[PDB]
Amino acid sequence: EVAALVVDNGSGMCKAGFAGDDAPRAVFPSIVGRPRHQGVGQKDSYVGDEAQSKRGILTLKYPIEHGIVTNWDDMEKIWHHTFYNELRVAPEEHPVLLTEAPLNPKANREKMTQIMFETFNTPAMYVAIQAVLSLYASGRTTGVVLDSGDGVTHTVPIYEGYALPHAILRLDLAGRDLTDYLMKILTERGYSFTTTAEREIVRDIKEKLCYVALDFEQEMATAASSSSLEKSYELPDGQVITVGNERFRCPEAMFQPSFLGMESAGIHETSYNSIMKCDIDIRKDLYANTVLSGGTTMYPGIADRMQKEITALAPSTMKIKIIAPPERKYSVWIGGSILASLSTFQQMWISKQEYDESGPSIVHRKCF
């Protein structure tokens, strides 16, 4: 009958679509662009791809930082655009499932709820934790999800369907940081990538040529002795550059945050640390179900490296299993699509009547 919408608001990319579809229909930058100056660039503002393209006359703003909404005026713009321009629906006709970052502030959960009902007049809505949706998408109720996107990286242990908040940890290093780092080390070869179009080239190099070394220091030596690891990348004009040990040095930063000057533990240690904060009786299950999600976990070789690193930290008895689905850039969204599609989800939604009865605080009792 009635079709639910699923929206995953990332710090970098928004994924939106219809519950029941196996993939989001709209994937676009989480940006709002407003007139750069105040003179004569037609509308009042732009969102997504159009904003990024018209950046020459706009000043771009990112409403979501570290997965948390920091500008509600701009977030509304993004949601308005999602409904009317990207999905082409009348929001008042569809239940809406929205995702949130682990440990999303209580006040933000209420605000998201208020906006949906009061601004967009949704007949029903729900807020789900991103990590949990990714676990469900992998067909599990227990595991530790390592979600790394554009904002920050989170390790979220989940037991029998529910996250364990006390054990959620984080590494404040993610996709943008790695693009920035690649931009930098590439200059050490004699390349300058400072403009937006240039940062886009770097991001593409990161996404297409980078990989995680099983043994870094050995990968480094391999490179210092041979041109075996070197690739060549053809720039948009025709200019060709050669990418060398930057291919594995860039993602290495995830394991060695000191590369970016951080004194934080790498993702393997953060995962192990989260598991160790959980009841000893469920740790075996967590070690055997470490699930990777998010665009920044897409580097080839990352699962083999995570298996090797976590195996070195955990007792030799523990069976270590890293689950890295090919579709993990959309795992959160897919999980949402499945959840909102279930016949048993009807009573889970916060309805218009419920919102009208308790107000935004209803979210703390319906979505936990």
Partner 1 sequence: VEHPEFLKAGKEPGLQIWRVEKFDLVPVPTNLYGDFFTGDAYVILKTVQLRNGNLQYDLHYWLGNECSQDESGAAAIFTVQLDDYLNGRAVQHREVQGFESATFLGYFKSGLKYKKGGVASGFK
61 binds, among Mg ion, ligand ATP, partner 1, none (CB under 5 to 8 A by kind): none
Extract the tokens encoding 69.
């909404």
Which of 52, 70, 341, 358 is in the footprint of partner 1 by CB under 8 A?
Answer: 341
Reduce the DSSP state of residue 337 to 3 states and report it: helix
Interface of this chain with partner 1, residues 185 to 204, rule: CB under 8 A = none
- Tell me which of ligand ATP, Mg ion, partner 1, none is bound by residue 142, counting a contact when its beta carbon lies within the kind-specific cut-off of 5 to 8 angstroms: partner 1
Q: How far is the CB of 290 from partner 1 (least distance, A)?
A: 14
Listed in order, strand segments (DSSP E) in 72-137 are 96-100, 124-129
Total residues binding Mg ion (CB under 5 A): 2
Answer for the pair 62, 78: CB distance below 8 angstroms, yes or no: no
Query: Within 10 A of 176 (CB to CB), how many other CB atoms are there?
Result: 17
- Classify 190 in phi/psi space as left (phi over 0), alpha (psi -120 to 50) or beta: left
Of the candidates 167, 161, 142, 178, the one whose C-alpha atom is nearest the C-alpha of residue 270 is: 167
Piece of the chain touching partner 1 by CB under 8 A; list 87-95, 110-118, 302-310, 336-344 = 336-344
CB 183 within 8 A of CB 201: no
Residue 358, contacted partner among Mg ion, partner 1, ligand ATP, none, CB below 5-8 A by kind: none
Interface pattern 268-307 for partner 1 (x via CB under 8 A):
----------------------------------------
- Partner from ligand ATP, partner 1, Mg ion, none contacting 155, C-beta within 5 to 8 A by type: none
Residue closer to partner 1 by CB (options 160, 237) is 160
Nearer to Mg ion, 71 or 256 (CB): 71
Tokens of 65: 């930082």
Does the protein bind Mg ion through residue 10 (CB under 5 A)? yes
Instruction: Among 140, 231, 277, 308, indicate the residue that binds partner 1 (CB under 8 A).
Output: 140
Q: Is 311 a residue that touches partner 1 (CB under 8 A)?
A: no
DSSP one-letter code for 25: S
Contacts with ligand ATP, residue ranges (CB under 6 A):
10-13, 67, 149-152, 174-176, 179, 203, 206-207, 294-296, 298-299, 329
Query: In terms of C-beta density within 10 A (0-12 exposed, 13-18 middle, 19 or more buried), how is residue 22 classed?
Result: exposed
Residue 1 as a binder of partner 1 (CB under 8 A): the answer is no
Residue 149 engages Mg ion in binding (rule: CB under 5 A): yes
Residue partners of 126: CB distance under 8 A and separation at least 6: 95, 96, 97, 98, 340, 348, 349, 350, 366, 367
Question: 298 or 314, CB closer to ligand ATP?
Answer: 298
Comparing CA positions, the residue from 94, 73, 55 lying closest to residue 196 is 55
The pair of structure tokens assigned to 33 is 């662009």
Q: Pick the binder of partner 1 from 160, 217, 234, 263 (CB under 8 A).
A: 160
Shortest spacing between CB 31 and Mg ion, in angstroms: 15
Which residue's CB is nearer to Mg ion, number 149 or number 336? 149
Q: What SS3 class is residue 232? A: strand
CA distances, 103 to each of 132, 143, 155 (Å): 12, 18, 12
Compute the least distance from the CB of residue 69 to ligand ATP, in Å. 10
For CA atoms 5, 6, 9, 12, give the dihedral sign.
negative
**Quick check: 272 and 304 in contact, CB under 8 A?**
no
Q: Which residues bind Mg ion (CB under 5 A)?
A: 10, 149
Q: Which residues bind partner 1 (CB under 8 A)?
A: 20-22, 135-142, 160-162, 327, 334-335, 337-339, 341-344, 346-347
